[PDB]
Design a protein around this ligand. Sequence first.
Ligand SMILES: [Zn+2]
Ligand SMILES: [Zn+2]
Ligand SMILES: [Zn+2]
Ligand SMILES: [Zn+2]
Lengths: 25, 121
Amino acid sequence: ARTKQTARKSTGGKAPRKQLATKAA
Amino acid sequence: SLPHEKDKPVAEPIPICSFCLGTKEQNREKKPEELISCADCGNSGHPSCLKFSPELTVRVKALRWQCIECKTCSSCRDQGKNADNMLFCDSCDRGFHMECCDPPLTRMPKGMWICQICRPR
Ligand SMILES: [Zn+2]
Ligand SMILES: [Zn+2]
Ligand SMILES: [Zn+2]
Ligand SMILES: [Zn+2]
């Protein structure tokens, strides 16, 4: 079964927030 | 389909995947793929980046879905201390504390797990 923890690990983690904001702009 | 899910408004979606920084026009394969967006915070992800199955992809689009970090238990409506041990349904991706399921769970289930909403349907 999946948990919040296993789901976090499965994705490999978010890209940097600053890099996300540079693209949105 | 749950009462609080129909009732609560949804955030403005951010049109960039939080994992690959791609868009609905480009995922990690540089191919189009619609984003899934969190109803609470508006952040988004490609289902491929979320590692969704085809079932999860088709089902969460119709629901008031929450991202991994916003997810609250569908019974007690809280995140709780043991939020890391909250189970995610393998059909609808809703979260449940083990103690908040019916029947309550004391040991972590093995293999696929389907929540009490999805089992009868
Ligand atoms: Zn992505
Ligand atoms: Zn969120
Ligand atoms: Zn709960
Ligand atoms: Zn379910």
